[PDB]
């Protein structure tokens, strides 16, 4: 029961900037996702979509530009599971995105759109948040 | 103290993971980001929180001299506590979390492409140290 979040950066982001997300996967949990979208719009464009499928055993990556999404990336198996706290870090570099989970590095979602068009980051689905930093 | 040997270098989206505890007797414990795995090497950043001065001290070393000393608010380590540190290299310096929160941006001063090594010492009881 903290979800939707929204931590909105008007200023951007910029390689160094490390997002910091822990919460739990809710007993009967089937996915929750992360966002980096480019605007408070509805629709806007993502640099990254990372996405925890509990119910599917996956964790998927994509962008969507201009309404379209493109190709799905996938990580190997699902570091997440129902009924467990996580820790995710999500790391901007000048080469694209590095996603860490409980002490480990799971997956390098090269990049696709401009970081610098980054605006906003949300947080959404079946996942009870605890907190959601940016440094 | 503890090596991590880092032939790699460090580019700015490197994070430093350190958890550990803090020994009741501890005095102070530092994090080094050394330019070179010989002793005596540049330092591009000490980290030396120092719970016996109630106190944090940031600094770096360039042949032999140790450059101007920074200082953050306050100390956020107590005796017999473990602690969560995160060091965050960016374009324009690193960053150090303690916590929950952002403690301290120290300026970068020695390029940062010359980093080869993190060296842990002092009254530390380490954990776990994991370069991202």
């Not at 979040?5 to 200023?11: D, Q």
């Not at 980096?36 to 962008?63: I, K, M, W, Y």
């Not at 990580?75 to 467990?84: A, H, L």
């Amino acid at each position: 029961s903290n979800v939707p979040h929204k931590s909105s950066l008007p200023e951007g982001i910029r390689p160094g900037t490390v997002l910091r997300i822990r919460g739990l996967v809710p007993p009967n949990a089937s996915r929750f996702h992360v966002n980096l979208l480019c605007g408070e719009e509805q629709g806007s464009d993502a640099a990254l979509h990372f996405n925890p499928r509990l119910d599917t055993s996956e964790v998927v990556f994509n962008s969507k530009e201009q309404g379209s999404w493109g190709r799905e990336e996938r990580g190997p198996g699902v570091p997440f599971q129902r009924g467990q706290p996580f820790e995710v870090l999500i790391i901007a570099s000048d080469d694209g995105f590095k996603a860490v989970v409980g002490a480990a590095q799971y997956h390098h979602f090269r990049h696709r759109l401009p970081l610098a068009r980054v605006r906003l980051v949300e947080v959404g689905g079946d996942v009870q948040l605890d907190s959601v930093r940016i440094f």
